[PDB]
Structure formats: C-alpha cells, structure tokens
Design a protein around this motif. Sequence first.
Motif, PDB file in Angstrom:
ATOM      1  N   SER A  38       0.839  -1.191   0.000  1.00 42.63           N
ATOM      2  CA  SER A  38       0.000   0.000   0.000  1.00 42.63           C
ATOM      3  C   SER A  38       0.874   1.240   0.000  1.00 42.63           C
ATOM      4  N   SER A  39       0.253   2.415  -0.095  1.00 42.05           N
ATOM      5  CA  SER A  39       1.009   3.627  -0.419  1.00 42.05           C
ATOM      6  C   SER A  39       0.590   4.840   0.382  1.00 42.05           C
ATOM      7  N   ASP A  40      -0.015   4.599   1.544  1.00 42.01           N
ATOM      8  CA  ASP A  40      -0.381   5.653   2.483  1.00 42.01           C
ATOM      9  C   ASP A  40       0.447   5.506   3.765  1.00 42.01           C
ATOM     10  N   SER A  76      -8.895   7.794   2.733  1.00 40.40           N
ATOM     11  CA  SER A  76      -9.742   6.688   3.138  1.00 40.40           C
ATOM     12  C   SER A  76      -9.238   5.442   2.429  1.00 40.40           C
ATOM     13  N   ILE A  77      -8.946   4.401   3.197  1.00 36.21           N
ATOM     14  CA  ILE A  77      -8.347   3.218   2.615  1.00 36.21           C
ATOM     15  C   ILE A  77      -9.017   1.974   3.152  1.00 36.21           C
ATOM     16  N   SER A  78      -9.070   0.955   2.302  1.00 40.93           N
ATOM     17  CA  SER A  78      -9.542  -0.368   2.694  1.00 40.93           C
ATOM     18  C   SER A  78      -8.529  -1.393   2.223  1.00 40.93           C
ATOM     19  N   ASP A  81      -7.581  -7.410   3.775  1.00 44.64           N
ATOM     20  CA  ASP A  81      -8.084  -8.183   4.906  1.00 44.64           C
ATOM     21  C   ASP A  81      -9.421  -7.639   5.426  1.00 44.64           C
ATOM     22  N   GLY A  82      -9.950  -6.595   4.791  1.00 48.03           N
ATOM     23  CA  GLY A  82     -11.244  -6.059   5.171  1.00 48.03           C
ATOM     24  C   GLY A  82     -11.179  -4.913   6.164  1.00 48.03           C
ATOM     25  N   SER A  83      -9.976  -4.593   6.622  1.00 45.86           N
ATOM     26  CA  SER A  83      -9.794  -3.491   7.562  1.00 45.86           C
ATOM     27  C   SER A  83      -9.767  -2.161   6.801  1.00 45.86           C
ATOM     28  N   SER A  84      -9.924  -1.053   7.525  1.00 44.39           N
ATOM     29  CA  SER A  84     -10.016   0.272   6.908  1.00 44.39           C
ATOM     30  C   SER A  84      -9.707   1.394   7.890  1.00 44.39           C
ATOM     31  N   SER A  85      -9.448   2.575   7.340  1.00 46.66           N
ATOM     32  CA  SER A  85      -9.183   3.758   8.136  1.00 46.66           C
ATOM     33  C   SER A  85      -9.346   4.983   7.251  1.00 46.66           C
ATOM     34  N   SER A  86      -9.535   6.144   7.868  1.00 48.09           N
ATOM     35  CA  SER A  86      -9.718   7.372   7.113  1.00 48.09           C
ATOM     36  C   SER A  86      -9.444   8.580   7.983  1.00 48.09           C
ATOM     37  N   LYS A 111     -10.871   7.893  11.931  1.00 48.37           N
ATOM     38  CA  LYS A 111     -11.577   6.634  12.122  1.00 48.37           C
ATOM     39  C   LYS A 111     -10.666   5.477  11.722  1.00 48.37           C
ATOM     40  N   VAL A 112     -10.701   4.398  12.507  1.00 49.45           N
ATOM     41  CA  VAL A 112     -10.022   3.140  12.175  1.00 49.45           C
ATOM     42  C   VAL A 112     -10.992   1.986  12.436  1.00 49.45           C
ATOM     43  N   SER A 113     -10.862   0.888  11.694  1.00 50.05           N
ATOM     44  CA  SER A 113     -11.738  -0.255  11.934  1.00 50.05           C
ATOM     45  C   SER A 113     -11.238  -1.057  13.129  1.00 50.05           C
ATOM     46  N   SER A 114     -12.105  -1.934  13.622  1.00 48.01           N
ATOM     47  CA  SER A 114     -11.858  -2.665  14.863  1.00 48.01           C
ATOM     48  C   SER A 114     -10.536  -3.429  14.860  1.00 48.01           C
ATOM     49  N   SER A 115     -10.148  -3.970  13.708  1.00 47.58           N
ATOM     50  CA  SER A 115      -8.913  -4.737  13.606  1.00 47.58           C
ATOM     51  C   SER A 115      -7.709  -3.903  14.041  1.00 47.58           C
TER      52      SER A 115
END
Length: 330
Positions: A38-40, A76-78, A81-86, A111-115
């Motif tokens: 990834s690139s962020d 905003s990225i996904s 593995d289904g995880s995400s953040s923004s 925001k970040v996902s639970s993982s």
Amino acid sequence: STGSATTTPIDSLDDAYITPVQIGTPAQTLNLDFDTGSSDLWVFSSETTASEVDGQTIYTPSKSTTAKLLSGATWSISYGDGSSSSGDVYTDTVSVGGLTVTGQAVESAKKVSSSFTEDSTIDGLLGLAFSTLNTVSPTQQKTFFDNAKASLDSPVFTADLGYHAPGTYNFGFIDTTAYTGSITYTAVSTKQGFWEWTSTGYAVGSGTFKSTSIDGIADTGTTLLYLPATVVSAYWAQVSGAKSSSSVGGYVFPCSATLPSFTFGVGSARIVIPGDYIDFGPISTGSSSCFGGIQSSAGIGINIFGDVALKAAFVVFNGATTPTLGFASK
C-alpha cells in the motif's frame, strides 16, 4: 543519504512487523507497519475517535512545530483483509533510521476499523508500494520512499525480515553482508501499483521443481503466502491430516506435524522457506489444529508473496526508472 531501521515482529507468530518512525518536531516516535502493498503513511492520532484507540501511541500534530494541515485533503483506505481507516492530512518531517524527509504527507486517522483498534502494537502504516495507489484526495501524495529517492545514494530499499526475530529495513544501499550468494533480479510490473513480479515455479519439500509462471506481489504488509489453489493443494497434500477448513477459513494441519519446506523460483534462483516458517500455531488457544502459512489466493484476485515468503530472503526493492525486485538467500 541512507537510512537503516530495525523491524521487530509484533508477536510470537510474526503476524506483522513494526519499525520505529520519527514524526514531527520534537520527534514523536510511532511504531509503523511498513507495507510494500500500500502507499499511504497513516497514523493513530489525537484526532482518532477516542473509543477506537486502545493502547496505541498517537501522533499529535498540534505539538509539532513543523506540522502543517494540508488544507482540504482527506484519505480513506480499505485493505485486502477487510480493515479500513480514514482521516485528514498533515505534512511534517518524517525520519526512518536516520533518513529524513521534510514535507511528508502524514495521514491522520479520524476513524479506524476494529482490527486496528484491537492491535495495540501497530501505531499506523507506512506504505512502500507505488505512489499511484495513494488515497489522498483531491491531491494524491507521494510515499516516504518516493520523497526520499532522489536524495538516496541508490534508489532502493531492502527488506530483511526475521523469523521469530528482528530484521532490518535499509534505504539507499544494499548491505552485502546481509545475504549469501548473489541477488537475482526479476522484472516488475507497476501497472497495478504493486511490486508485481513473476515467480518461475515451486517445489514442495525435497520434491522436484515445477517450472510454472506465478504472477504475484511482494507484500511486506501481508502475513502469509497466498498462491494458486493447485500449488497450495500440492503443498498440504504432503502433510498428514492437513485439510482446507471452510469454517476456519483456510488450510489447517495437526499441530503434531513436521511441515515440509516450500521453494519458490526467482529466475533460475531458488528461495527455500523452511517448514517451520509455515506454522501459524493453534487456530484457537489450546487447540491441536494449527493454521497454515501457505493459503489459497483463489478469490483474492492476486497471488501474494507475504512475510512467510519474504522473510526467507533478502529482498531488494529497486526503484530505478524501471523498477525491479531482487531476491537473495540469507
């Protein structure tokens, strides 16, 4: 210039690796997951929803005299593995192992996902794929490597991940004492934004080498080795009692097994992954069923040479005008 930083497994299974990164002035050191898929460059921050922070170290841009809000920018990225953040974006000074970039985009998570919340050891990601994948809008931003490249002694970085042990990320030079034999270089396609290459085949244990082209990505941010179902079935067929479990989500094997090695081709060269690298331990605490480190890529859409594969090698990410990948045994 050059940089050199130690990267350390987050847990006893090598589920991921963290590398300390200095952000801002005075420095705020965060432990980031260097991700060649990834690139962020994004971080837990003082802006992250409080309920979604659980033990991570945060970046506080208001305490950095060199932080500047990048007006209007969001990200905003996904991930696969289904995880995400923004969140939003600052520019600030970022240093890795002595190598400093000024004006680096530091993407601050709102925001970040639970993982991510659930993993206290990872303070963010530092993306090392091609900048064409960067998610910042409306003005795409460059990766740390892209920003550093022109200043580096050589436009390269290397990944030397350890098995159950620390390793090293170097920027701008190749440590000729870190590998055995020669480095074999292979072509890269940047068309999908990844370090995408074609392996020349595989062997299982002491079995004969099967010559066959396997397109995939070199991805330090993925734990396991994901390969075509045919290859994966051939591997697990050599482990008594191994099976694909739909309920668990992949191949499992009896924890009492001795796993065979797995060899992959790089041109005419061969990288051997020892069997022990393929053991990811009990599926749940106390279980005698263990999770395999080689899994099918079917339904991912791409083969992924993740940490299981990369940690068996010294890996050169060559960011010359025409990028290439190099692999050596070590």
